[PDB]
């Protein structure tokens, strides 16, 4: 019969995985570590011995104005992090075009609070980068079950 328990923490069936980044981004280093620690998978340096391939298209974190006071004063700054990727076969065959990750953090603009200004742009950044990589992890581990459940992708 086989019983359905939970001995795994964040693990998946396909152990051998290969990563490919277009311009070699920071997220590439985070991903390998997050995978090896949370999942049963183990990242290879070459696709000769991989069961699946994780590909990233773009990952840019920029910042722009969100709200204004007095029709001129900067209130909050929208920290927009655009992540787009794909989930391919061991031979780079696109079976699952992975969806988009929507991450926007709220940067409170303050002149006197220099401490806060040296805090938010790290706290909101590290939390957001960590979230994004944990999201990809959660999507890859979900795709082995279904994955298409989150539906929306870039258009």
User: The domain spanning residue 58 has which CATH number?
Assistant: 3.30.160.150
Residue span of the structural domain in which 136 resides? 15-155
CB burial of 92-120 (b: ≥16 within 10 Å; e: otherwise) equals eeeeeebbbbebebebebeeeeeeeeeeb
Q: Is residue 2 part of a domain?
A: no
Q: Is residue 4 part of a domain?
A: no
Q: Is residue 114 part of a domain?
A: yes
Helix/strand number for the chain, H first, E second: 3, 7
Supply the DSSP symbol for 77.
E
- Beta strands 16-20; 42-44: pairing state: parallel
Experimental method: NMR
Q: Centre a 10 Å sphere on the Cβ of residue 70 and count the other Cβ atoms it contains.
A: 6
Q: Is residue 10 part of a domain?
A: no
Q: Is residue 28 part of a domain?
A: yes
Q: Is residue 5 part of a domain?
A: no
Q: Is residue 61 part of a domain?
A: yes
User: Do 19 and 43 touch, CB atoms closer than 8 A?
Assistant: yes
Domain count, the chain: 1
């Amino acid at each position: 019969m086989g019983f359905k328990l939970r001995g795994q923490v964040s693990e998946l069936p396909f152990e051998r995985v290969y990563i490919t980044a277009p311009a070699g981004l920071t997220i590439g280093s985070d991903l390998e570590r997050v995978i090896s620690t949370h999942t049963r998978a183990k990242v290879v340096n070459k696709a000769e011995k991989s069961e699946a391939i994780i590909q990233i298209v773009h990952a840019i974190r920029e910042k722009r104005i969100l709200s204004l006071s007095e029709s001129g004063r900067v209130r909050e700054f929208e920290l927009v992090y655009r992540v787009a990727a794909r989930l391919l076969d061991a031979h780079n065959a696109e079976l699952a075009s992975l969806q988009e990750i929507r991450l926007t953090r709220i940067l409170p603009f303050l002149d006197a609070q220099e401490l806060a200004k040296a805090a938010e742009e790290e706290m909101l950044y590290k939390d957001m980068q960590k979230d994004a990589v944990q999201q990809i992890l959660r999507q890859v581990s979900a795709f082995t079950s279904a994955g298409l459940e989150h539906h929306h992708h870039h258009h």
